[PDB]
Design brief:
Chain A: This is Regulatory protein. Chain A: Keywords: DNA-binding, Plasmid, Transcription, Transcription regulation. Two copies of one chain form a homodimer. The first copy, chain A, is built from five helices and no strands. With 78 residues, chain A is mainly α. In chain A, 24% of the residues are buried.
Chain lengths: 78, 76
């Protein structure tokens, strides 16, 4: 698997739930396909930086807060 | 033209120079093509998370340190 990929998709899912959105909601807000979002949270697709940027825009989260959460996630141990 | 992508490739170049590596060096260390590295640094290639992970491994930088630098860059 890709370790980093699983951390990124974890944080996408986490913010999604915090915002109270479904996968369809995120698809709609991103201009992305439902299956692609579904696939990303399943880690069964690779994700470009441009798609990530479309996802952050769909989530309505700033770059900084997103990466700050990623760091927190990468650090959580045991 | 993608803002985030330009920030990412900026930090790749920055760390590359800090480590004293040429693009060929990075290509060799990443198992990526010269042209791909070259393209990434001019913002003319899109890059997946897996490629980014290959790149960080070639630069011998940890995930945290890389994204810490990315945040710094974005806030500049």
């Amino acid at each position: 698997e890709s370790f980093l990929l699983s951390k990124v998709s974890f944080v996408i899912k986490k913010i999604r739930l915090e915002k109270g959105m479904t996968q369809e909601d995120l698809a709609y807000k991103s201009n992305l396909d439902r299956t692609y979002i579904s696939g990303i949270e399943r880690n069964s697709r690779n994700l470009t930086i441009k798609s990530l940027e479309l996802i952050m825009k769909g989530l309505e989260v700033s770059d900084v807060v997103f990466f700050e959460m990623l760091i927190k996630e990468i650090l959580k141990h045991d």
